[model samples]
Target: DNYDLLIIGSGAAAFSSAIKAIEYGAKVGMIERGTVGGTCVNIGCVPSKTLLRAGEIIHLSKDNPFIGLQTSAGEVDLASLITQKDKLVSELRNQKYMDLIDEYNFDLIKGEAKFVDASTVEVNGAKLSAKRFLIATGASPSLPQISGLEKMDYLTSTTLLELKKIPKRLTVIGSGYIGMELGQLFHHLGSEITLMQRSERLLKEYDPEISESVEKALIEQGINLVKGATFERVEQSGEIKRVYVTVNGSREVIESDQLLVATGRKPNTDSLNLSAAGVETGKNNEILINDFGQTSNEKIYAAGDVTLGPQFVYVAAYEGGIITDNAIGGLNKKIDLSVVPAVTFTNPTVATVGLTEEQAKEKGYDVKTSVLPLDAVPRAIVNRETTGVFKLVADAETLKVLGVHIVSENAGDVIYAASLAVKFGLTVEDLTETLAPYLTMAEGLKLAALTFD
Candidate 1:
């Protein structure tokens, strides 16, 4: 079979590219080895965030940051809650992805795809060709090298989401976003969670200040954090899993009923046999793409986690759309990720856009930063959930807002306005002059921006 566009992987990037091809009235075809929709709906975003919220509600009564108001904690049914989550995923997948298969009228091929050549692919021994190709095959949870890790029972983010039972004691390896979010989520769901980190601070990518702030909140909520943890090995005794680690030069052993490896994720490229197709991958096994998403072989392009960019749903969709836009009109649209906003949906959600103060300084900016505590915001004071900080980084000389980082309640929703400011090179004055509603978390940005005055 042949097509105007042939896309690999049925993830966000593939879906977005397929939609764009439909707009151009092209004969598009998609191949998938897994579920119709990719990570977001099936296992990544939807299921995890749903469980995160469910866990949040369960913990509110006990951790009730809302003082002066008393409430009884509700009993959690792990099985029923998981059933509900799975139901939501099923409905969304049908509505968002499966339904689209018939709606778009594109040829949907189900099988593992291997590149036969620059413009041709083979799936299940059938040869296929397209005028253009977009590789959107996303990534998977990265497995670490640890003794007995392969022999013992462990869970990745994907497996943990659909778990039927809540673990009594859970130990999470790697203190990145996945580890922190799930680790804390289980903690709130009445599990004793111990998070082991290789670094001194959690979320090593974020600003150190934000990590410290979030660490305090997690610790206050009773999540055990072991810093500078050098994972030595793992062993299983009866039903319990024991992890031996050197924490700050001291040997320590942690035991838990369940072990979660949130180390990270790696791109799905090895199976594709890219070398036969003349496609080049980077050091991380990510496809090398030009500004317009074209790969080393100009006939082929890549996007999403498979490409060298941030692994976010929105980013993947944007990149895939860009590929189609260029194919249609030669718009030469390049992916600009300068001010992309990202959120970590922990208890006090962490969101940020653009550069941090350290990032700004490293980029040779005369950086100035202002950090306002959640209590500084009137709404936080009223609600008694003052467990975060909102910070703004700007150039003292240019007055342009470099970045905005928020570690507060509903920070994800609040970062969009700040994202726009950074994208447009708006100054601190721009954010301060904007009228934020009274008694809202968003107002924290205005207060922090005004501090420059």
Candidate 2:
């Protein structure tokens, strides 16, 4: 069979690209080796957030004194929570992806797809040819070659969400966002959590200050953070699991009922057989694509986690749009990554858009920064969530907003306004001068920007 465009993977990027192709009146075929909605809906963002919300509710019952609510005791029904999350994901997958196949009239194939040639792909004993192709295979957890890990029963984020019982003690093998979010959730739900990180800090991609804030918050919540730890091995004895690590040349052991490996994710290109299509992948197995998302072969393009970019669902969707515009619409639309906002859905969530202070400096901008503790804001004071800070960075000369990093309640929604300012080239003074609603989180951003003076 032949198609005007062929898309591999059935995630946000693949769906977005398919939508665009349909808009341009192209016959498209999409193939997926796994569940639809990629990592976001399957195991990455959606399930994580849903699980986090349950954690937040438990946290609020225990900690929120302003509501005059008290709980003598509470229990986390892990089985029910997991079931609910699965139901939601399944419903969304149907609504978001499966329905689109019929609506867009695109050929949908459910099987592993491998490239037969630069313009041909084979899936489940079927061959498909296309004028243009997009690879949005996304990524999967990178299981490190730690001794004994393969022998023991452990769970990654994908399998962790399906856990039916809350272990008395849960040991997380990584301290990235996945570990942090899940650890916090289980910790708040009355399970003891120990987070292990290879580095001295969590979320090394962010500024040290932000990482410190998160670390301190986690520590205060009675979560154990084991940093600077080198993982040696893992072993299981009956119902108890033991994690062995070397810290400062000393062997340390921690035992738990459940072990979660939150190490990291690698691009999902290994099964694609790209060599057959004359495609080249990097050391990370990610496809190399140009600014316009075009591969080494002009007829081939890549997006989402399979390409070189931040692995956010929004970035994938944006890349998909750009690729489709250039490939199907016959317009040259280069992918612009400036001011891409991201969020970590933790308690007192951390949200950021655009550059950081170090990033601004790297971009040759003379940067001025302003930070205001959320407690200082009237709304935070009233709401009693005083554990976060809002930070804004700007160009010293032009005062244009370079970045906005916020750690506060509803920081995700609040940061969007800041994102718009940076997106539209608004200055720090411009944000300060704008009339924001009083006693709101949005005002916290305004006050943070005003401090630039």
Candidate 3:
């Protein structure tokens, strides 16, 4: 069957592109190799968050600072917890993705698609042709090249969620956002976490102050963080696992009941025969695309994690929309991620938008910054959680806001307001004069801006 637009994968990017094509009255057909919904709903966000929230309740009950009130959490039913998570995933997948197929009346092909040529794809030995093709297949967890790693069994971010029994001691490799979230999640749920990272601090991608604040929080919670680790190898003997590494020139053997490798993710394009379609890939096998989401071959385009740009579901969806307009409507709708906001779901969630101080200076801006400790924010005082900081960077001459980096509770929600400020070029004086309600987490932004005054 020939289609106006054919999309590979059934994730956020594919769905977004398909919806836009349908709106334009173009016939769209989507192919999926496995589950309909993408990583965000099935494994990444939905399941992880529900379990994280459940762990948060356990943590707060044990350590919350409310004088004269005694609270303690009971034993956790991990099986029951997982069951509830699965139920929610099932319901959302059905409602959001599965039902959309029948509702939209678009062709849903269930098989692995391989490009036979530039304009032809063979799925299940049947030829399907499309004027335009979008490869939106998302990424999967990537493991580091450690000796004996391939032979030993280890949990990935995906498989870890399916474990019925929590490990007494879990040794996690890589301290990126995924590693930190899952490590802390298991720690709060009564696991001893040992997180090892190649860098000297956690979250090296963020401002150093934000990393320091999160480091303090995680250390206080009794989670072991091993920084500057050079992995040598890994081994397994029966149920126990061990990691050998060099830390600060000292060799060490870290043993644990289980091992988790949260190194990172790689694009899911191995089976697509992209070379046959004249699509070029980069070092990590990620599809190469231009600003307008156009691949080397004009007839085929790629977006989302397959392109390895931002690796966020929202960004993927936006890229998908752009592909539809550019491919089908011949509209050169480019992507602008300059104002993108990133959040890490930790005890004090890390949220940041725009440039850092170093980045602003490199970009030729006369950078001036304001750093505000959570102790100065009334909301943090009332909540009895004061181990967070808000750092704002701006131009010294124009006074325009350049960036905002925050490590605090609900930092994700607060980042949206900062995103608008940076995107619209709001000045420091504007934020200081703006009326921020008393004792709200977002009020810290105004207070941080006031520091510049």
Candidate 4:
């Protein structure tokens, strides 16, 4: 078989590229080894986020700050809830991906694809060729190198999402975004959670202030956090799992009914045989791509998690769009990721965009920052839930917004405006002068900007 473009994965990047390729009058085909719609629609965002919201409802029902309204949460039906979540995932996959296969009229080969040469690939002993190729095969959960871990059964984010029963006690390794979100998910689902991190602070990538606030919230919710944890080994005894770690220069042991290794994810490139096509990869096996998404092998390009760009679905889709334009349309459409927004969906969701105070200073900006507690926000005060903060970083001389970080309710919704500010170099005066509707979380951004005055 031959095509104008061949995509190596059927996830967001693949679909986006294929759609654009087809629109540009280019014959396009896609190959996949697993379910369609990739990680986000399958195991990553769709299932996990829905389950997180369900867990949130359960948690809030038991503990709200309302004075008169009474609420109580009973036993969680894990099996039934999982069934519902799976149903939604299936319906979405069909709607967004499976149905699109027929609607878009593109050829999709089902098998493991390996690069046969610069211009050709072999899947299940069948060969296909294209003028250009896009490797969008995404990433998978990465397990750490702890001893005896391979001998014992452990759960990844994928498996944990479909866990049949709620664990009585759960221990999570690696306090990155995934670990933090899933740790709190199980905690709200009525499990005792203990999160162990190699770093002293959770979310080491985010601002320290945000991590402190998140740590406080997690501690208040009764989740155990172990700082500076070094994994020694893991052992399973019957239904219980035990982990040994060196914390604070001493050995400590933690036991739980189940263990979740949310260490991180690695690109799915080992099976692709990229060397056959002269494609280069980075230290973590991520495809090496230029500004235009073209790989070391110019005939081949990459995008999404496989390219090791931001692992967000939106980022993948954006890369796919630009790769399609550059490759098929013969244009130079570089990938711009300067003002990306990210959110951690724990309770009091953490949202951020652009540079932090440290990042701005390191970038040689005359940085100034403002930290506004949620109590200062009228909406938070009215709602009686004021355990968060709004932080804004800007240029000291220009007063232009450099970044915005928030640890408040609905922070994700408010970060879009902040992203706009950073992307367009909007100043603090622009935010403060603009009227924000009263009694809304978004007003916090304006209020935080006012602190600069």
lDDT of 2: 0.85
Instruction: Report the C-alpha lDDT of model 4 over 1-453, residue by residue, as the tens digit.
Output: 678899999989998998888888877888989787899988989888898999999898988888787999999999998899999999988788654545465787889999879899999899998899999999999988989899887889998987998999999997668888999998998999999878888788889889899889889889999988888877889876676678998989998898889887899999999999999989887899999999889889999998887889999999999999999989898899998899999988999999998999999999999999889999999988888899999998999999999999889999999999999999999998899999999999999998965
* Ten residues in sequence with the least summed lDDT for candidate 3: 97-106
Model 1 TM-score on a 0 to 1 scale = 0.97
Report how far off residue 400 is in candidate 1 (Å).
Answer: 0.9
**Per-model C-alpha lDDT, please?**
0.87, 0.85, 0.90, 0.90
TM-scores for candidates 1 onward, in order: 0.97, 0.96, 0.98, 0.98
| TM-score winner, 2 or 3 | 3
What are the RMSD figures for all models against the true structure?
1.4, 1.7, 1.2, 1.2
State the lDDT of candidate 2 residue by residue for 243-332, as single tens digits: 677887889999889989988788888888888888888987789998888888889999998886887999999899999999897899
Q: Following a full C-alpha superposition, what root-mean-square deviation does model 1 have from the true structure?
A: 1.4
- For every model shown, the clashing-pair count is 0, 0, 0, 0
lDDT of 4 at 390: 95
Better of 2 and 4 by TM-score: 4
lDDT of 1 by residue, 303-390 (tens): 8998858889999999889988887557888788887999999978999899998899999999998988887999889877788999
Off by over 4 Å in 2: 97-104
